[PDB]
């Protein structure tokens, strides 16, 4: 099995852990507890070729987990997550991308923008706005919700496609 070292980055309280557990264990966690480092391992078939995702779950609390540069060294592809009901986390994506490029020392790192928390009726971020940000970076954009398991299976699968295109 070819191994993909996915890394999940994002602001605090956006659903990185709920989105990663939803992919791994197919069950949604509602209790919110900050995560320093979690590593999950999943085996899937993506486009017919069996791969093993090694989904490292990072911490979102600024100044409360300053080891961010340690995770980005080991990852292959990143999954910038923001909560659409949370405006503040959306602008933060730019800082994450900048922090990713400096660590990887490249401008073509495989990334996916993911907009979590779709089922919540409030929408402080518009889909058209996020795609415009996603268009400038060139990374794709996926619209996901952890409770209804929408797009969470496509969000991580898309990032594997991005790493596969980048690797050759």
């Amino acid at each position: 099995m070819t191994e993909y070292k996915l890394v999940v980055v994002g602001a605090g309280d956006v659903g990185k852990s709920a989105l990663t557990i939803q992919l791994i264990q197919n069950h949604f966690v509602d209790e919110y507890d900050p995560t320093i480092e979690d590593s999950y391992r999943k085996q899937v078939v993506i486009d017919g070729e069996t791969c093993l995702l090694d989904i490292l779950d990072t911490a979102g609390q600024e100044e409360y987990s300053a080891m961010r540069d340690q995770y980005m060294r080991t990852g292959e592809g990143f999954l910038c997550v923001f909560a659409i009901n949370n405006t503040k986390s959306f602008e933060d994506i730019h800082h994450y991308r900048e922090q990713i490029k400096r660590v990887k020392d490249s401008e073509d790192v495989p990334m996916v923008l993911v907009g979590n928390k779709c089922d919540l009726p409030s929408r402080t971020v518009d889909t058209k706005q996020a795609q415009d940000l996603a268009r400038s970076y060139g990374i794709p954009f996926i619209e996901t919700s952890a409770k209804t398991r929408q797009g969470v299976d496509d969000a991580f699968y898309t990032l594997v496609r991005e790493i596969r295109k980048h690797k050759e």
């Binding site: 197919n26 391992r41 078939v45 209804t148």
Partner: protein, 467 residues
């Protein structure tokens, strides 16, 4: 680099050398080390190795008592500040407010990461491997004494998380599917009539779907605490490993049930219809990736009472003999063709503990407990990293559940299977073989005709679902 505190006041500051820790030839993989070093690498500050937290906490009870580990975690969490330099002292000596150029770096690169990973180990320890605290009620008290000690607005959210987990674990997972479960498929036996259930009355698919849910549930309950010490073979098998032994004993029941159905059908035309029904079930096990069921039907057709039935296997259609030869090849050559199937599928799975039990047990016998290099006894962490790769390969299959509907009436029929009856293991195995010598006697004795047993028709509905 940076001036770590003096090794006299802080044990873990002692520098790496060949007498402490051995690295395997970008994250370094440690081959061995003294206990002090393993907790140093467990909560190392430069890199994040979240496998190590899972590899260490699974297998550490061989080389470190649970009480002793927590004393090392306290000693790791309480990091003393390095002694100030002369210029920093001059501000301190005169009362001047010191700039603290090096201490400012120290608290951001050494104390902040190391203190943060210690709580990561503490919350990982409590959440997953909680049986340590239940057995030792004194350990939980020292755990809660440590949590209260943690102070600061930073790391005040995390001690809320550990405390929330402890109170949750002391008093003791809804699944969402993208797809609806396929509808239950029925046959001669009608829903709600438990008395008419049997091998031929039930639909071949729904026998295979309920066995897969029944076997998946027994597979997902097996925790690594029942495998890591090679404990299931010790004399405390029923106390240490109740979950694992319930899955092994279920696999044995089905294999004997499949043997019992085949040899107890006296009439050849009926028996051929049964053996074909079982192969249709073995075909659904391959669709559902239920490799435990595949090796509990293959193990029934390779058993001595059923292998010798050469007359009843000649009448099977060659399509279904191709399935059995394909399914039996999985177990050939030390499971080489099955191991390659287990690593190339989209898992919802029920793997086979046959090969994880014989790898965990031979990894623990073969490798030595400690490594002696330069005259000092280092804990062989390579032995306990190989073991935790197997108990970490079990778990990557336990996560994903099945999208199948649980039928309570059938699932109760398979939990309450007693192929042995009141008999014992050796008597039954003889009873099956002798009944196999009765229905197809060894050559050159004639094959006697036998009466038909089942009243209902024997036409198999087929592995294809009705949709």
């Amino acid at each position: 680099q940076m001036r770590l505190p003096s090794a006299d006041v802080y044990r873990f500051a002692e520098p790496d050398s060949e007498e402490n820790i051995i690295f395997e030839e970008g994250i370094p993989i440690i081959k061995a080390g003294t206990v002090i070093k393993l907790i140093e690498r467990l909560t190392y500050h430069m890199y994040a190795d979240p496998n190590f937290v899972r590899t260490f906490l699974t297998t550490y009870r061989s080389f470190c008592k649970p009480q002793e580990l927590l004393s090392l975690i306290i000693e790791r969490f309480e990091i003393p500040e390095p002694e100030p330099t002369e210029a920093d002292r001059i501000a301190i000596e005169n009362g001047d407010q010191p700039l603290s150029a090096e201490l400012k770096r120290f608290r951001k690169e050494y104390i902040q990461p190391v203190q943060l990973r210690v709580l990561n180990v503490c919350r990982h320890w409590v959440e997953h491997h909680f049986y340590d605290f239940e057995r030792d009620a004194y350990l939980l008290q020292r755990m809660e004494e440590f949590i209260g000690t943690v102070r600061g607005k930073a790391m005040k959210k995390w001690v809320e998380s550990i405390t929330k987990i402890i109170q949750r674990k002391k008093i003791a997972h809804n699944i969402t599917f993208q797809s609806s479960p396929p509808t239950v498929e029925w046959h001669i036996s009608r829903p709600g009539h438990i008395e008419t259930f049997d091998l031929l009355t039930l639909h071949p698919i729904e026998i295979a779907r309920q066995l897969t849910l029944l076997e998946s549930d027994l597979y997902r309950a097996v925790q690594p605490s029942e495998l890591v010490g090679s404990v299931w073979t010790k004399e405390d098998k029923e106390i240490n490993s109740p979950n694992l032994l319930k899955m092994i004993r279920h696999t044995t029941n089905l294999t004997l049930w499949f043997e019992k159905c085949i040899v107890e059908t006296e009439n050849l035309e009926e028996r051929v219809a049964v053996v074909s029904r079982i192969i249709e079930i073995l075909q659904v096990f391959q669709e559902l990736n239920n490799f435990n069921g595949v090796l509990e039907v293959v193990s029934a057709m390779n058993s001595s009472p059923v292998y010798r039935l050469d007359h009843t296997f000649e009448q099977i259609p060659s399509r279904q003999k191709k399935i059995l030869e394909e399914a039996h090849e999985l177990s050939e050559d030390h499971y080489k063709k099955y191991l390659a199937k287990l690593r190339s599928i989209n898992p919802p799975c029920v793997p086979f503990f046959g090969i994880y039990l014989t790898n965990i047990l031979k990894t623990e016998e073969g490798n030595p407990e400690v490594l002696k290099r330069h005259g000092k006894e280092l804990i062989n962490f390579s032995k306990r990293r190989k073991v935790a790769e197997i108990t970490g390969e079990i778990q990557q299959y336990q996560n994903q559940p099945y999208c199948l509907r649980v039928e309570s009436d059938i699932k109760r029929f398979f939990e309450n299977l007693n192929p042995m009856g009141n008999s014992m293991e050796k008597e039954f195995t003889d009873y099956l073989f002798n009944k196999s010598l009765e229905i197809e006697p060894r050559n050159p004795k004639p094959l006697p005709r036998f009466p038909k047993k089942y009243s209902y028709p024997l036409k198999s509905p087929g592995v294809r679902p009705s949709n």
